């Protein structure tokens, strides 16, 4: 069947792994074990049509930044994740988009801006600011919580819908 290579990118600690595991395994990872790189494959039904998700969970740690080139070339859609209580992680979004451009010659790739940890009361990134960033990129903005599952399917399934509608 059809396989979609989705890649989860963003600064360290924003919840990329927790988002991935909550999607794949319906389980919240409470521990913070920094990622080098991991992939997870799962069959899912999206809008009544079955497909295989191949999710690449990537490093936020800058010491593994060299790895970006390989996975940005073959990645078919990207979740660009920041945490709503981490303004620096929001500042960092643009770098990922720029690197996706240096290897794809455009940012003409399905992408979703993901504001994670929305279960937390303390927010330092304004919703309107994240909405405006996403608008400046022409991509959706989705608020998620890997802990409650809020928005998690929407974030990943939006990428598949965007690929299907190319």
């Amino acid at each position: 069947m059809t396989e979609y290579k989705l890649v989860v990118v963003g600064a360290g600690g924003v919840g990329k792994s927790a988002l991935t595991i909550q999607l794949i395994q319906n389980h919240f990872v409470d521990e913070y074990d920094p990622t080098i790189e991991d992939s997870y494959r799962k069959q899912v039904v999206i809008d009544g049509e079955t497909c295989l998700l191949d999710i690449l969970d990537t490093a936020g740690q800058e010491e593994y930044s060299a790895m970006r080139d390989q996975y940005m070339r073959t990645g078919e859609g990207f979740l660009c994740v920041f945490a709503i209580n981490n303004t620096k992680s929001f500042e960092d979004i643009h770098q990922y988009r720029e690197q996706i451009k240096r290897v794809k010659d455009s940012d003409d790739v399905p992408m979703v801006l993901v504001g994670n940890k929305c279960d937390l009361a303390a927010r330092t990134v304004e919703s309107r600011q994240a909405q405006d960033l996403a608008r400046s990129y022409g991509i959706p903005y989705i608020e998620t919580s890997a802990k409650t599952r809020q928005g998690v399917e929407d974030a990943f399934y939006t990428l598949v819908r965007e690929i299907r509608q190319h």
């Binding site: 389980h27 074990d33 991991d38 992939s39 997870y40 010491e63």
Partner: protein, 78 residues
Amino acid sequence: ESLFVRINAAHGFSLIQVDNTKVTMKEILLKAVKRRKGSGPQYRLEKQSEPNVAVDLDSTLESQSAWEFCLVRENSSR
């Protein structure tokens, strides 16, 4: 970058950080299972270049002269 080992599993791969090559293969297996499968089915590790043979989990990573392994359910094959 740290040293790390590539573990190929049924539904993807995991890169497992290691502090040095004196780590035991048992430690690497435990990390890979906990990340990929969570909390009982049993597993072995195999050298990438030697299918169907379980590595000695009490031996060190250095003794394997390998940096890629397959994680295989004991009732199955790679």
